[PDB]
Design a protein around this nucleic acid. Structure first.
Ligand SMILES: [Zn+2]
Lengths: 97, 148, 129, 33, 71, 125, 84, 82, 207, 221
RNA sequence: UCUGGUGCCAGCAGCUGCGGUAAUUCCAGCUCCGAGGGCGUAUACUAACAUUGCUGCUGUUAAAACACUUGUAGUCUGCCUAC
RNA sequence: AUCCACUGCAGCGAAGGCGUUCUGCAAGUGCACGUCCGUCGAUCAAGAAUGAGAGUUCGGGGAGCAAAGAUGAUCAGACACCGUCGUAGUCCGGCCACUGUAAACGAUGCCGGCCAGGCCUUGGCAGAGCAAGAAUCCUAGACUCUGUCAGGGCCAACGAGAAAUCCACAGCCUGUGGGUUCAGGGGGGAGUACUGUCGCAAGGCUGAAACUUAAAGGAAUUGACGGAAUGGCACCA
RNA sequence: CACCAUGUUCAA
């Protein structure tokens, strides 16, 4: 009952992979087993972009600064905060978004 | 490179089919004289062959004078006391020991030293069997330094 | 590492026949290998074969004709008397009618039927059917 | 879940109970000898 | 795998001999502790004196009382 | 919801394919047409079939409804598809602009024969 | 493009040019020798294609080929011609 | 096969793949049999043909097309470029 | 075509093939089709020699003409480019054909309405007609396919190097094939160009 | 009563095909047991046996559904044998459909000689092995007076296939009757599969029935 | 799928199981089956058993690849030398 | 103390393991080659050298985190999860400190031969290209294509398998033999007892039996369930 | 992401 051909991780030709810490839980998870997402947001969402750009001087729409986060998750917190969802046995082989 | 590693490489040279290319008017006495000239200068057989292959157009000394390089060295009294395989392995072990004796906590120089000394003994066994080395011969770390 | 060139040759030939190849390359060649191949030819399980000179353990190209089912080597080369011939037949061959055991005997590398008819035993060397 | 049916308690914890038992035994035999 | 090769007779025989000890039937037959420990010291029948009667509750799913005697 | 059943749809389809020349886009005359065409045991079923047929006829009027075969129009489409132009488009094309043939395709036509043939454009990539 | 199943005994030139110097049907050399001359002189040195160390003139001692990882790199202007 | 009298005891001697030499068994529903027509000099087809049986093993290994190529080269049908 | 010169291609035929682009492959290659590709263009397309294309075309013609009772031949094409071609091919040879979607189990399900038990079947594209090839395997019928340079010729017995993805390429190939099949049997002559155009085989949209 | 569906059905209904080897020679699918009932009549030239009727259960909510797999062997003792495994909800229909499937799956069993070729073939021509699941079943050629030395399932299959002598070596979970009978059936199948010097010579292809009766087959449409 | 008694009791039963008031299995009666001047029981060993595997086992997950290299004894070792 | 992002179906190392920059020291693999030797090799009981983390020893260090402990909640209990602290420990050095175990895993011994196709990637070597800053010159370690050797993977035939699955192997296996080492023989008792040996200790290695039991177990299926996910729904919500 | 422990024996 090996569930994954790569046993939940992308470690190949390695022996040891650095252990990183989950973003919220704080769990030590291998760097390749972790579900990692580099997310880019804005300091301001469109619920406030007009209200701030109307009072800004050096900014406007399409100009506000961004947030670059790189959230790394353990499998538990990924599945709970629904970053990832359980997939079918046949749809587990899908590796592109 | 398969003996003491996971290496599976095959990069070795490959002779022709001929066994002289109809050029190289140079003949046996000349090539042997060249061999002995650059053997007097301390150059070992493997380097003799390369210095005679690169710029002199003499590949496969054997083909010009059927005696291989070590044969023509022994036939002129210029062959070393210990074969160059052993000699270079001894020198490598000497350097590794010299290193780790001060880098006392390498723990990988130690492993590679175990390997190179195992090779040294596996080859010294063969040479003692073939009588190229004296029957009493033995590789000691403490005295190998005074051979290079 | 590289035991029994004959074993490697026979396994290559059997794998080629199994894959359906019409000619197989074998590397290197030996006297034992050539005599085994000639014993196969004599009964027609093997087409022509020719040796290409490497100057380094010459190689062989055998032409296969679909009549082979299996070539194998029996290692170690057990000794075989004439009473043991029937034991080896009933254990190795698929039938008592066709298929052959190759034996190295004091009379050269020999078929098992030829060995039985000219009254000699020897060391087993393989089989083909 | 990650494993199939230990037919007792967790093998790590019964291994640990065995180790504690073993050194209690060791102390009782060191009493005598 | 096992050693083929025409001079591995000692290896093969010693391995078979040291490995036969994992057959529990052979092991109990050859290990001289059953003649010692078993009450029938290698014997079909023995004679004894009835010491007491015993009612033994049958194992699940059965619920009888088997009548035995301590001998 | 008012999703129809196949006992209505598959009857609408054959009624259309057999009587497209008689029906209209009017429900209450398609009703009187079907009440003489079909033997429907129920008037509610008659009216469901009639309404679905009027819907399909309205879609016919609108545009190409995918799923019916009006023969007296599909024979027309078939015979126009089977109409022959006097000159094959490929013939007049090789007359007008020859044929664009690349470097290695000229190399292949030279490898075989047909190398020095007419109407080539000698194009390269 | 042949329609023919190339037998191993007579292999095509295209495929046999690609093969490793060992995995050919007959193992052969993957090198050659060169007659080489520098404009600074006339002596025709005979060098190896894949030189292992530096090669200089017999008299001028000006480097002709300089060793690299693979084939030799002949110096600026040194004319060369492959030998049979 | 016969029985020492020259009397064929084997019913249904099967047919063999023409590329390999392997027997086509009684359940090889992937095997095929052909008829490549023969043609006179004037381009017409006389009712003559060369027959070719292929085995399901070949037709799975995908060497059936190249086997046909080889067989027609042997039978002087496919024209080599030259 | 080996001994027969009258079956060799004509200059006009090669011109109208190069026109319909049947000499062009795709950026992908199969090692079983590597034998029919002459070379590559520096944009990647594999040009495949109309010589071998014509050899395999006249070979398929030989098989199709040796097959008497042409109603035992089924042309198959699933993609839109090719259905008009197979319809015309059936019309002019006597063969049978199928619609866009091959009903799975025709060549296996005996109690099926669309049984279609042929003696041979001619397939436009293997990658698209993967089904009929499988049922061929299950039913012992040979397969003659128009194999592009990107085509699994697993159960294909007679592959023909083609394009399979050009609406005029398919029409051209089926026109050539039916022309050869009608030249054989003594129905069509050689010198006289036969009256049916190639424009009838190409794919025309409904409107 | 039996309106033939396939070309083989029509040919055997109209006596264009003579007997089974005419279909075996081209390996054509049968798909209709009426063909083999035409060539081997029901009572006499074909005996059928029911080896086992095993219930299998699919669990459902509110109960569990039980259905019987019937294993039926079909054969006359001259070299033909077939194996049909068919589920059904009732034992009657299971057995009937299994007889039909076994009749469709009837195959020819090559028979050979162990030693001298004196009379008629009596044993398997070669050592054969059949696989299904873990059950490997080896059929070994036995001499004239050895008899069938199999165990029940292979014994009756070999009896039906009409071999007089055979040694066997079953290796798997032989108590699984399904696989244990499929293995020996597969072995009897490989019997003709193995190639011998007897079959070394030329092929000499023939017209298949479809080509040979193309004119007849093009009328019933 | 016999008849009476018993009613998870008595008991049977190598294993699976039978016995809880309609027991095809207990206690009996009748009947029937098997070996038969014999049959049962217990114990030991053999075969079954390719479940000790030389022929001839298995080792990803069922029992079982040493953490990993080295390395002695042991085992095994490339091509060639007469018409 | 630790070296984010870069950081990956990337590389290296016998494995454990290895990530800031400059630098000292020795080393390895691969590749290239008409260099040398000339069988010197494969696997290996005993033996030897490395061996995560925990643990121990001697001397320092102590930010952060944290067994034990303290302590506030939660709870029926809660010296549990949760929260606040907190000691050993984690960090450094040592006769070359000791130990010598891990789901030390690819749960897959090592050497050798053969094994369809397609795709990605690492390092060379070879041959080409429309292929690169400042400029426009000029070359350039960049990029593209092809071949090949070595490495790391992915998906796809035959075959194998109980299946899951394997696929440069878990294929070539009842059509069974290339060579070699280790281990297993129903489940427990038990990796226990005794003994031996190593260690400061913890403990490692070695390692039974009496007795007990008919199943343990593996893969897969159908249903049921879920304080699992998704999507529909009901005033018996 | 408060807390949500349990269900006598054989039989089906
Ligand atoms: Zn988390």
């Amino acid at each position: 009952t090996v569930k994954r051909r790569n046993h939940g991780r992308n470690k190949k030709n390695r022996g040891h992979v650095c252990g990183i810490r989950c973003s919220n839980c704080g769990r030590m998870t291998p760097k390749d087993k972790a579900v990692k997402r580099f997310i880019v947001r804005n300091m301001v969402e469109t619920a406030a972009v007009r209200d701030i750009a109307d009072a800004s001087v050096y900014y406007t729409g399409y100009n506000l600064p961004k947030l670059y986060l790189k959230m790394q998750y353990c499998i538990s917190c990924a599945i709970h905060g629904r970053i990832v969802r359980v997939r079918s046995v046949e749809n587990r082989k899908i590796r592109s978004p | 490179g398969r003996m003491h590693s996971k290496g599976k490489g095959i990069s070795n040279s490959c002779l022709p089919y001929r066994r002289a290319p109809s050029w190289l008017k140079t003949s046996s006495r000349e090539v042997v004289d060249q061999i002995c000239k650059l053997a007097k200068k301390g150059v070992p057989p493997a380097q003799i062959g390369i210095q005679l292959r690169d710029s002199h157009g003499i590949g496969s000394v054997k083909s010009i004078t059927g005696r291989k390089i070590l044969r023509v060295l022994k036939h002129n009294g210029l062959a070393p006391e210990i074969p160059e395989d052993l000699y270079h392995m001894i020198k490598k072990a000497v350097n590794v020991r010299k290193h780790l004796e001060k880098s006392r906590k390498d723990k990988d120089a130690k492993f590679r030293l175990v390997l190179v000394e195992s090779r040294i003994h596996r080859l010294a066994r063969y040479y003692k069997q073939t009588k190229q080395l004296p029957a009493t011969w033995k590789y000691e770390s403490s005295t190998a330094s005074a051979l290079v | 590492v590289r035991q029994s060139t004959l074993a490697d040759c026979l396994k290559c030939i059997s794998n080629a026949e199994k894959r359906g190849k019409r000619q197989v390359l074998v590397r290197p060649c030996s006297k034992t290998i050539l005599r085994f191949l000639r014993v196969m030819q004599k009964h027609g399980y093997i087409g022509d074969f020719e040796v290409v000179d490497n100057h380094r353990g010459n190689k062989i190209v055998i032409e296969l004709n679909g009549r082979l089912n299996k070539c194998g080597v029996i290692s170690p080369r057990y000794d075989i008397s004439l009473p043991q011939m029937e034991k080896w037949i009933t254990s190795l061959l698929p039938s008592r009618q066709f298929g052959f055991i190759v034996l190295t005997t004091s009379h050269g590398i020999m078929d098992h039927e030829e060995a039985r008819k000219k009254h000699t035993g020897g060391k087993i060397l393989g089989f083909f059917y | 879940g990650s494993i199939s049916r230990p037919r007792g308690m967790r093998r790590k914890w019964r291994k640990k109970r065995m180790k504690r038992l073993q050194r209690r035994r060791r102390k009782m035999r060191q009493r005598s000898k | 795998g096992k050693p083929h090769g025409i001079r591995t007779a000692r290896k093969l025989r010693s391995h078979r001999r040291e490995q036969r000890w994992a057959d529990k039937d052979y092991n109990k037959r050859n290990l001289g502790t059953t003649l010692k420990c078993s009450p029938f010291g290698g014997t079909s029948h023995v004679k004894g004196i009835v010491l007491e009667k015993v009612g033994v509750e049958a194992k699940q799913p059965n619920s009888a009382i088997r009548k035995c005697v301590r001998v | 919801g008012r999703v129809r059943t196949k006992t209505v749809k598959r009857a609408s389809k054959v009624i259309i394919e057999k009587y497209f020349q008689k029906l209209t886009q009017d429900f209450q005359t398609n009703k009187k047409v079907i009440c003489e065409i079909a033997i429907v045991p129920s008037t509610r079923l008659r009216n469901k079939i009639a309404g679905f047929t009027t819907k399909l006829m309205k879609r016919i009027a609108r545009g190409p409804v995918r799923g019916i075969s009006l023969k007296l129009q599909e024979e027309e489409r078939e015979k126009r598809m089977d109409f022959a132009p006097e000159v094959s488009q490929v013939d007049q094309q090789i007359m007008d602009q020859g044929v664009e043939v690349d470097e290695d395709t000229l190399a292949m036509l030279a490898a075989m024969d047909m190398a020095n043939i007419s109407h080539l454009k000698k194009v390269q990539v | 493009s042949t329609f023919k199943d190339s037998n191993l005994l007579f292999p095509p030139e295209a495929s046999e040019k690609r093969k490793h110097k060992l995995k050919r049907l007959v193992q052969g050399q993957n090198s050659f020798f060169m007659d080489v001359k520098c404009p600074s002189c006339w002596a025709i040195t005979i060098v190896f294609s894949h030189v292992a160390k530096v090669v200089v003139c017999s008299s001028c001692n000006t480097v002709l080929a300089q060793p690299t990882g693979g084939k030799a790199k002949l110096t600026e202007g040194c004319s060369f011609r492959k030998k049979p | 096969m016969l029985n020492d009298e020259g009397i064929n005891v084997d019913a249904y001697i099967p047919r063999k793949c023409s590329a390999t030499n392997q027997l086509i068994t009684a359940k090889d529903h992937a095997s095929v049999q052909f008829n490549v027509g023969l043609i006179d000099e004037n381009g017409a087809y006389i009712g003559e043909y060369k027959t070719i049986a292929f085995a399901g093993f070949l037709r799975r290994g995908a060497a059936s097309d190249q086997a046909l190529n080889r067989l027609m080269l042997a039978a002087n049908i496919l024209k080599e470029k030259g | 075509s080996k001994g027969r010169p009258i079956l060799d291609p004509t200059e006009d035929d090669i011109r109208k093939l190069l026109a319909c682009k049947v000499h062009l492959g795709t950026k992908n290659l199969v090692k079983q089709m590597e034998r029919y590709v002459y070379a590559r263009r520096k944009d990647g397309i594999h040009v495949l020699d109309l010589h071998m294309t014509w050899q395999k075309l006249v070979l398929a013609a030989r098989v199709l003409v040796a097959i008497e009772n042409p109603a035992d031949v089924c042309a198959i094409s699933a993609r839109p480019y090719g259905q008009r071609a197979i319809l015309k091919f059936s019309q002019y040879t006597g063969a049978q054909y199928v619609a866009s979607r091959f009903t799975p189990g025709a060549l296996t399900n005996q109690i099926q309405d669309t049984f279609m038990q042929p003696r041979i079947l001619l397939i436009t594209d293997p990658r698209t007609d993967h089904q009929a090839i499988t049922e061929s395997a299950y039913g012992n019928v040979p397969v003659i396919a128009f194999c592009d340079t990107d085509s699994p010729l697993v159960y294909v017995d007679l592959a023909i190097p083609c394009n399979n993805r050009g609406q005029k390429a398919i029409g051209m190939l089926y026109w050539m094939l039916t022309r050869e099949i009608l030249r054989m049997r003594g129905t069509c002559p050689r010198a006289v160009p036969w009256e049916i155009k190639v424009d009838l085989f190409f794919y025309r949209d409904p409107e | 009563e039996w309106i033939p569906v396939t070309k083989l059905g029509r040919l055997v209904k109209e006596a264009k095909l003579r007997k089974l080897e005419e279909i075996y020679l081209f390996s054509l699918p049968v798909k209709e047991y009426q063909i083999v009932d035409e060539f081997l009549p029901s009572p006499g030239k074909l005996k059928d046996e029911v080896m086992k009727i095993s219930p299998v259960q699919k669990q459902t909510k509110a109960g569990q559904r039980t259905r019987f797999k019937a294993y039926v062997v079909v054969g006359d003792c001259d070299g033909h044998v077939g194996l049909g495994v068919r589920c059904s909800k009732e034992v009657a229909t299971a057995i009937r459909a299994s007889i039909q499937a076994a009749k469709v799956a009837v195959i020819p069993v090559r028979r050979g000689y162990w030693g001298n070729k004196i009379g008629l073939p009596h044993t398997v021509p070669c050592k054969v092995t059949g696989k299904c699941g873990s059950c490997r079943v080896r059929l070994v050629p036995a001499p004239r007076g050895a008899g069938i030395v199999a165990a029940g399932v292979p014994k009756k299959l070999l009896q039906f296939a009409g071999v007089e002598d055979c040694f066997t070596q079953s290796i798997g979970q032989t108590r699984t009757l399904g696989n244990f009978v499929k293995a020996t059936f597969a072995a009897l199948s490989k019997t003709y599969g193995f190639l011998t010097p007897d079959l070394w010579p030329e092929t000499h292809f023939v017209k298949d029935p479809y080509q040979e009766h193309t004119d007849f087959l093009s009328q019933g449409l």
